[PDB]
Design a protein around this ligand. Structure first.
Ligand SMILES: O=P(O)(O)OP(=O)(O)OCc1ccccn1
Ligand code: F3S
Length: 309
């Protein structure tokens, strides 16, 4: 059994920054450090930090006075930011620069009272945060997930309409949604393509190449990781068996019995150590040396704020 590794895979720049924000806050101020929501959607990263004295919470009320609070990489609504602003807290923001970029455009629309449409998945925290940048009752903020959602949407003024997307969507599905918005709302304005980040685009391209060599694809990532789900999905749609797994223990041997070529990738929130353990397990089940495929280069790093160095 040949083991192949997708490239790129694993940690993106936003994840690496957000984890280091929490680590360094814990290093400078000691435990406990409060973090609103899982800093990233990876159980292993969260349990690590948790056991290091970071405390994950879901509302600002849970955080006491004089505390340190980190916003997760997914970002937060204005309402959440304001509730923190005026609550005697030291706040550090681990929101990924590539989410903040989308936030600034929703805010722009809201100020001009012009309607905005977000392409994304209902109830995800990025979506909550991004919708929660729009506040103007004169305009509106709408969520669509599919072409059908678009075909059903009515707006107040379609002459003054913009769109934005979640950063971790399927490139192909999103493209279909955008073609729909453009056919329904010919004046709609948006980015040249979408707001899907480089990491999501790159990992999707990478898992495509992987899937055309491997019969089975394992994706290391947690169940609530949107980007990780897209990777498994993409492989499955190519007709390969694909499984989303937190770690090596989740591998059931039937999945790879009599499989000649197995592929492994990782979502953007999944540490390389997890991939290493998965590969060790596959080798126990009869795989050889892991061969990394050729991949598109990634070179972006996002530094922590000066005051967290
Ligand atoms: O894929 P999702 O579920 O959004 O989250 P993660 O698995 O934490 O991936 C990193 C991330 C954070 C924030 C924004 C984009 N990407
Ligand atoms: S939005 Fe940022 S957190 Fe990672 S998956 Fe994309 S670089």
């Amino acid at each position: 059994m040949q083991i192949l590794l997708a490239n790129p895979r694993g940690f993106c720049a936003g994840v690496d920054r957000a984890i280091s924000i929490v680590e360094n806050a814990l290093a400078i101020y000691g435990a406990p450090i409060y973090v609103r929501h899982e800093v990233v959607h990876n159980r292993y990263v969260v349990d690590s930090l948790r056991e290091r004295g970071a405390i994950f919470i879901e509302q600002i009320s849970e955080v006491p006075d004089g505390a340190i609070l980190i916003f997760s990489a997914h970002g937060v609504s204005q309402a959440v930011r304001n509730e923190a602003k005026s609550r005697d807290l030291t706040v550090f923001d681990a929101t990924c620069p590539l989410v903040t970029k989308v936030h600034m455009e929703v805010a722009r629309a809201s100020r001009r009272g012009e309607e905005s449409i977000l392409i994304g998945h209902a109830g995800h925290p990025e979506v909550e945060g991004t919708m929660g940048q729009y506040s103007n009752p004169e305009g509106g903020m709408y969520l669509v997930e599919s072409p059908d959602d678009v075909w059903k949407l009515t707006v107040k003024n379609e002459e003054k309409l913009s769109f934005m997307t979640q950063t971790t969507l399927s490139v192909d599905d999103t493209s279909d949604v955008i073609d729909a918005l453009r056919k329904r709302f010919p004046k709609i304005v948006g980015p040249r393509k979408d707001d899907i980040c480089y990491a999501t685009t790159n990992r999707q391209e990478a898992v495509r190449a992987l899937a055309e060599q491997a019969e089975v694809v394992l994706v290391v990532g947690s169940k609530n990781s949107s980007n990780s789900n897209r990777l498994a999905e993409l492989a499955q749609r190519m007709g390969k068996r694909a499984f989303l797994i937190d770690d090596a223990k989740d591998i059931q041997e039937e999945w790879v019995k009599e499989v000649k070529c197995v592929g492994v990738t990782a979502g953007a929130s999944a540490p390389d150590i997890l991939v290493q353990n998965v590969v060790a397990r596959l080798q126990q089940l009869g795989g050889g040396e892991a061969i990394p495929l050729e991949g598109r280069e990634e070179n972006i790093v996002f530094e922590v704020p000066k005051e967290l160095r």
